[PDB]
Each structure stands twice: as C-alpha cells, then as structure tokens.
Amino acid sequence: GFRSILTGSFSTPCADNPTVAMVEAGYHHAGLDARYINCDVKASGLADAVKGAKAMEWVGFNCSLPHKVAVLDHLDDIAESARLIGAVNCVAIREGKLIGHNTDGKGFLASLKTVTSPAGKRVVILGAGGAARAIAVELALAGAAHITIVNRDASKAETIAALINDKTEATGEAQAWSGKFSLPTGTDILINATSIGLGDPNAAPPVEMGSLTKETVVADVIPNPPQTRFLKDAKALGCTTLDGLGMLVNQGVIGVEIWLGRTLDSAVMAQTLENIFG
Amino acid sequence: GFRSILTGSFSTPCADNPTVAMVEAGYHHAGLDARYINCDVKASGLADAVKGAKAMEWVGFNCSLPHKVAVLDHLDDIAESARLIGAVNCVAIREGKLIGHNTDGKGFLASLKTVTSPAGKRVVILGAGGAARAIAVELALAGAAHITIVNRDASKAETIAALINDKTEATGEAQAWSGKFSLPTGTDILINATSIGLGDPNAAPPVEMGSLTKETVVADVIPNPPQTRFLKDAKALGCTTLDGLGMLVNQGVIGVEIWLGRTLDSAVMAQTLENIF
C-alpha cells in the first residue's frame, strides 16, 4: 500500500546534489515503490542520522561531504575497497546491520569494463584527490599492473602510490606535474581526476595530447559537461573516451544493486542528469 | 534545488495509512517542495527515529499506533489539548525543539464547524477508545455544555467523564453500554468513535435510530468506508452527517499548518482519499 522502500543521503550542503533526481528516475522507470531522501545532516548529527535510518527501516543510504570518513565510526562492517580507501559513500542496512561500501571508483571501473579489462593495464591518473584515491584502489584490486598518479603536489600523489604498493599487487608510482604531462610509453588508460574542465568547456588539464596513442582509453570524472574539452580532444585524435556522467550513472546503479538487488535503467538516469545539467 | 522540506510519520504497521498520498497531493497543489515520509517504526526504535528526524532536519512528524503516549517521553513542550489528552500524534520541530500536539479531535471539530457550533451543545460519543478522549477534550475546550461517553467498559468512560469535569468547563457523564439505547431528546451531536463499521458495511454501533431527530448531527470517525452503515441509516432519517474522510483531511490540513504555517487545499486532499478508497 503506502509503505515505500526508503533510501537516501546524508551530506551538507545537499541542495545542489542531483542524485535524488537521478535515482528516483530509475526507481520510477522500474516501477519500484522506492524513494530517495536527500537530507542535510550536519557533522554533529551524523551519528543520530545513521541510527535514525536504521530505526526508520531504510535499506540504504549514501554519505557525501563531509561524512565519508566520519561514518566509518558508525558502521558494523566495512568492505575491502572501503577499508583500503578509508572512506565510505554507500551504506547498506541488512537486518539492522550497517555495511559500508565505497563506490567512488566503481562507476569508473564499470564504464572502463564496457571497453576493456583493467587487468594487467598501465594507467595514468591526473590528480590526487578523493576520486583519484578510490579509482587507484579499484583499478589495483581489479588487477591493473601499474598506476602512475600525477599531481602538482607530488607528495599527495606519493600517498596514493604508497597505498597501492603497500596494500595491493599493483605497482604505484608518483610524478610531479610540471607543464604538459607526457604519458610514459605503453600507457593503456588515461584518467582525469581533476576538476579542470568542470563547468568550463574551454578548460583542460595540461597534458601533451600528442603523447596519446589512438589505442589509449581516455576517461574523465567530470560529469558536467560530460563531453569535456579533454575528452573532445582525445576523441578527435581517435581515442575511445569515457565520460563522467556515465560514471555517476554507474555509481547509482551499483549503489541500488547493493541496496535492493535491482539494476536500474542507465539510459533514463543519464538523460535525467543531462536535463539537469542543460 | 534538490533538498525538499521533510515531514513524515512513525507508526507500526504503516502500509495501510494513506496520509502520505493525501498530504503530498496537498504539497504538490500548493507548489511546496515538501515530502511526507511514511516509516514503519517499532516501539524499540521510536527514540532513535525521533533523534533521526531531528538530525535529518525534518520540520515535523506524525505518530500513530503504537507511539502516541510513548512519544511524550521525547517532547520539549506540549500544546494545551495534548497535555489534557495525554497523547500526541503531531510533533513540530523548531530549532531542534519538539513540540507535541494532538489533532485526533481537531479534524472532527473542523468538520463539525461546517454544520454547527460546538458551544453550548449536548453531545453523545459512542466508545471510549480511539479518538473518543481527544474528541471529548476538543469539544469541551470549544465550549460544549454536556458530553456523554458511552462504553461497554464503563470505567474507561468514567475516566474521560472525570477529565471533562475536573479540567474543563463542560459537564462529563459516563454511560455503560448494554446494547441499543434511546438518545436524550436534546442530543445535538452523536459521534461514533468506535471501530464498529471499519472496513465493514452492515456493521453499525447499537443505538436506537428512532431516537434521532432531524436536528441531530451524526458523525463517524471511520474513514473507510466514508459512508458507513451508521451514517447511511442516519441520512435515511434526514440527519446531517459528517464522515471520517473529511475528518482525516482536516487532520492533515491542521498538521501541515502546525508544521509549515501553510493551509493545504482540502478539496484536492479529499479527492485523493476518495480515489484511494
């Protein structure tokens, strides 16, 4: 009757986060009586919000800024990649138990898998943020051979490289970013994890685009515009490209799979984000 | 933007409760980016659900069975009729403070005011359970003269009668129910507050229909079916009737006024419940 399945999000601020619209578009397309509740939860409210979703019998929730690290204190179980990353953005509630997952690198991995396998690949990640850390871990756990993290502050890249070497079978390497980064020979996958190009069709991270082969898979975490200058330049060179909007859609699909055992429709989720972004 | 104003309900079980559909239709019509979240909350989970609503920055919530008395333990303040009734079904969240209200009789009083004034009236309430106490208190606070509570368990009617006499200006009287009885000739308002007729045509509370007058307003709290056998029988004898659907609508309006200080459209909400049933 009138009891919808409850999911949602804890973050602050939350007003500009379109995940609610994306995920509910998926729910509606599937004919699933489920809701996503986008909550503005302050740091001092996180513990009570987590206990609140349990008491209200939600089946899952996301955590965004500034809760991804702090939430680990309130969980019963932490999945492998979340353990290594040290952050959780997707919590499942299973018979009162709170199970933390990290999917910030999994949207990218799902996009990647549509074109090639990560196993044995040599990868370059531009930038050393939260996105870069999760992407590096997921690639390493998925069998990548070599991961180079490129950052102006090389010590931040070195933190991720050290994580990869210490906790995975993959080799991690850090490189300081100075001028147009030239991809080392044999690079299979290039990923932008910077915000250069976010909301700016004319901005691109400083990469020597001529260092790409036509075989190099080029990906960008930026979801808006989904066709960034970086990706447009790569595609013009003949490269297979993966956009950040698709990755966000994949992350929502994976999360709802974790929560409810349903695979939502990617097309309607994507179109919802395209409409929101204009 | 993507943050909706959050409201909702804590109760168990909750799947049969249509308030979500009714309130959200009101929100939609009024252009309000607000949501009503219908949660199944067990007694063991009430304290954490309340703390949850505060942490998630809801602006209010309803409580239904089995939480109406238990929620008192979580309130920072309580409104006049709720304090008297000793139960709360509507809680406003203001600056992290929880203020408890009772609307279980206010829906009825709003419906009543469409046909008559409660002031100076002589009222018979069938049943001492459910909203009978809330209805008795609201009538008394609105100036009713005399309120008879009829119940099989006479002691339960006596408690309500004593509350009216001790804490209000109205007169309370308890009556032991032993089948069909004749209404006093001056009875202005007759209210079914039992569940007799709930999801069941041909079931009606036992009272002597022939003791009704043209002037008696006959009301039923049952929302489904809205036209109970009781009300159909009263209509057949020419009485003005008030159904439980309109009362639930009025409860929803009053609750949202408490939460948001906006009056939702009672026609769109009634229509929503009409479609559902």
- Chain A hits for B248, Cβ within 8 Å: none
Tell me the one-letter amino acid at B275. N
Rg (CA), chain B: 19
Cβ atoms A230, A86 nearer than 8 A = no
Please, which residues have CB within 8 angstroms of residue B183's CB and are 6 or more apart in sequence?
B124, B190, B207, B208, B211, B212, B216
Helix, strand or coil, per DSSP, at residue A61? strand
- Chain B hits for A46, Cβ within 8 Å: 55
Strand partners, A120: none
Helix, strand or coil, per DSSP, at residue A132? helix
Q: Which H or E run includes B276?
A: helix B266-276
Would you call the peptide bond into B13 cis, given omega within 30 degrees of 0 as the criterion? yes
Catalytic residue among B68, B180, B232, B235: B68
Cβ atoms A29, A81 nearer than 8 A = no
Q: How wide is the angle at C-alpha A118 spanned by C-alphas A113 and A119, nearest 5°?
A: 130
State the Cα–Cα distance between residues A248 and A254, nearest whole angstrom: 10
**Residue pairs between chains A and B whose CB atoms are closer than 8 Å:** 99
Cβ atoms B84, B30 nearer than 8 A = no
Query: Which residue in this structure is represented by tokens 């036992």?
Result: B206
Q: Phi and psi for A181 in degrees, rounded to 5?
A: -65, 125
C-alpha distances in angstroms, B33 versus B6, B10, B36? 9, 21, 11
Work out whether the CA dihedral B198, B200, B203, B204 comes out positive or negative.
positive
This PDB structure is determined at a resolution in Å of 1.5
State the Cα–Cα distance between residues B148 and B171, nearest whole angstrom: 8
Q: How many CA atoms lie within 13 A of A7 on its CB side?
A: 27
State the Cα–Cα distance between residues B33 and B45, nearest whole angstrom: 28
Q: Phi and psi for B138 in degrees, rounded to 5?
A: -65, -40
Residue of chain A nearest B51, judged by CA positions:
A48
Cβ atoms B4, B35 nearer than 8 A = yes
Rg (CA), chain A: 19
State the Cα–Cα distance between residues B90 and B61, nearest whole angstrom: 6
Which residue among B41, B45, B55 sits closest to A49, beta carbon to beta carbon?
Answer: B55
C-alpha distances in angstroms, A88 versus A52, A63, A82, A208, B3? 18, 7, 6, 34, 22
Q: How wide is the angle at C-alpha A98 spanned by C-alphas A95 and A103, nearest 5°?
A: 125
DSSP B36-89: EEEEE--GGGHHHHHHHHHHTT-SEEEE-TT-TTGGGGG-SEE-HHHHHHT--S
HEC profile of A139-208:
HHHCCCCEEEEEECCHHHHHHHHHHHHHHCCCEEEEEECCCCECCCCCCCEEEECCCCCCCCCCCCCCEC
DSSP tag of B210 = G
- Chain A hits for B51, Cβ within 8 Å: 48, 51-52
Cβ atoms B269, B26 nearer than 8 A = yes
Catalytic residue flag (residue B156): no
- Chain A hits for B18, Cβ within 8 Å: 1-2
Cβ atoms A130, A154 nearer than 8 A = no
The string over A41-76, giving b where at least 16 C-beta atoms fall within 10 Å of a residue's C-beta and e elsewhere, is: beeebbbbbbbbbbbbbbbbbbbbeebbeebbebbe
Cβ atoms B165, B191 nearer than 8 A = no
CB contact under 8 Å between A39 and B56, yes or no, is yes
Residue of chain B nearest A58, judged by CA positions:
B39
State the Cα–Cα distance between residues A36 and A79, nearest whole angstrom: 23
Please, which residues have CB within 8 angstroms of residue A11's CB and are 6 or more apart in sequence?
A17, A39, A40, A41, A62, A63, A64, A65, A66, A67
- The residue among A11, A48, A63 with the most chain B CBs within 10 A of its CB, best to mutate, is A48
DSSP A9-54: EEESS-TT-THHHHHHHHHHHHT--EEEEEEE--GGGHHHHHHHHH
Closest-CA distance of chain B to residue A169, Å: 41
Which residue among A14, A48, A55 sits closest to B2, beta carbon to beta carbon?
Answer: A14
Experimental method of this PDB entry? X-ray
B143: left (phi over 0), alpha (psi -120 to 50) or beta: left
Strand partners, B34: B5
State the burial class of residue B181 (Cβ atoms within 10 Å of its Cβ: 0-12, 13-18, 19+). middle
Alpha-carbon torsion angle B71, B75, B81, B86, nearest 10? 40
